[PDB]
Subunit: 281 residues, 2 copies
């Protein structure tokens, strides 16, 4: 495929010069398919996002992660157990109310800057329910938060009675324990990417929330209408600062490497029945 | 015109039996063109609304008023003085915020019933600015309020700093004194009707507000999308209780006929300074 070939050329010929060592904090981008780690400057991050976006629109297999580090956008990872194997409705009013409640906790952290600011919420959903297991990500990529503040906001969100109600009325049986408390620290999948055993989450709905410190009781939340007009890998990225839709608002602060060849014996080192080993160890 | 002929037949042959005397309290409907007053039961009100709606869709001259009486929907009459003769933008975010502020005053009146309820807001706008004079009606027809509560809500709304800001940013030079304090008591034009010297206000945008006593901080406001699907004379009526979109929520308790011919005489009669006449009376 042309756009995959283009991404391959960008990675090997050009971005190879930004390859980081294993466990290097400088790392912002992880390609879990090639097992490569990169520290991309903003210019080269954007070029990557243009290629990943073209690959996304053609349904290409991607497994890119961004590292959140100490100061970046907020991601909420919900792992739902459902009543049934039916995708829950999750219509705009429920998602709109979720945004409001998420914002109340952000505001209560006291780190928002004074003045008038737009922040965008994006809901990406697991494409199907598998054995009653369902998922969504809430991405607030533009709202640049300290890791410690994200952890605090996530702690508060787990105990939110209104959020638990919304999730319950959607058919969620684990509304108390569905929000991953490590949402603040885990590397976050780029839009169009997934674990190799899963399919990528799909953008259902995005919302624009405006807050004004002078008028704190007015918190307008509206659906974003022309989402398709933007580079979604770009806009949804927690570490991006050069989005068009998403403009930053700054808040107060495995080594065996088989390389697709040697792992085959791994596939037959599991179904030995060799638990008990008197001579067989 | 057929639909005007139909309305004429309904009024003279059928509804004539509901004609009220001048100053009757039973009156709910006033036809200021025919100078007739009626007390229509709900069945005959609906039949009227079907005919008025057909007449409205064909741009027919109507001057129907409904009397608010002591318990009915809320109407806000804004008379704006503007910076310019340009229609102010009044886009959904400004109107959405207006609804929220209007609701805060309704809630503060303490008369809302407990539980979950939808209430609809409709904004009808003066079709053009004339010498910087502009207008809109806010109709909350489903929210059945005591006259005394409406007066109280209107009093509070006049002094609302956020509403004054919104109106100021629209180019309103009288944001302190543009809301008619008699909005609670005046007879209210049916949708498609107007004073004989004015053109009828046009429905620009309607909003659905859901309130829940159990979850008071969640106040979702969304544009209504399929407005054209409904009988708008019917839905927008403050005294109607049998709308399809608008379901009631119960809160705690001369003749001119110029035919475009003598308007010329009015236009040439006023300019002389002969209002007093000692030799030419």
């Amino acid at each position: 495929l042309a756009e995959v070939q283009a991404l391959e050329t960008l990675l090997t010929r050009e971005l190879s010069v930004f390859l980081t060592e294993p466990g290097s904090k400088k790392t912002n981008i992880i390609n879990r398919i090639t097992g490569k780690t990169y520290a991309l400057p903003s210019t080269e991050l954007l070029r990557l996002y243009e290629h990943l976006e073209q690959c996304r629109k053609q349904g290409a297999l991607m497994y890119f992660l961004e590292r959140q580090g100490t100061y970046s956008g907020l991601m909420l990872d919900y792992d739902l157990k459902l009543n049934t194997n039916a995708v829950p409705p999750l219509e705009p009013p429920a998602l709109s109310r979720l945004c409001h409640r998420i914002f109340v906790h952000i505001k209560n952290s006291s780190v928002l800057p004074e003045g008038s600011h737009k922040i965008h919420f994006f809901f990406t959903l697991k494409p199907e329910v598998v054995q009653g297991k369902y998922g969504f990500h809430v991405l607030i990529p533009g709202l640049k938060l300290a890791a410690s503040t994200k952890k605090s906001i996530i702690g508060s969100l787990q105990h939110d009675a209104t959020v638990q109600k919304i999730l319950h009325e959607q058919g969620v049986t684990n509304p108390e324990s569905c929000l991953d408390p490590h949402s603040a620290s885990v590397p976050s999948l780029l839009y169009g990417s997934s674990k190799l055993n899963h399919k990528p989450y799909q953008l259902k709905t995005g919302f624009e929330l405006v807050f004004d410190s002078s008028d704190p009781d007015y918190i307008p939340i509206h659906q974003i209408k022309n989402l398709e007009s933007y580079n979604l890998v770009s806009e949804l990225s927690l570490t991006n600062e050069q989005g068009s839709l998403v403009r930053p608002v700054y808040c107060a602060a495995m080594l065996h490497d088989p390389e697709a060849r040697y792992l085959h014996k791994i596939l037959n080192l599991l179904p030995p029945e060799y638990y008990v080993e008197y001579p067989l160890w």
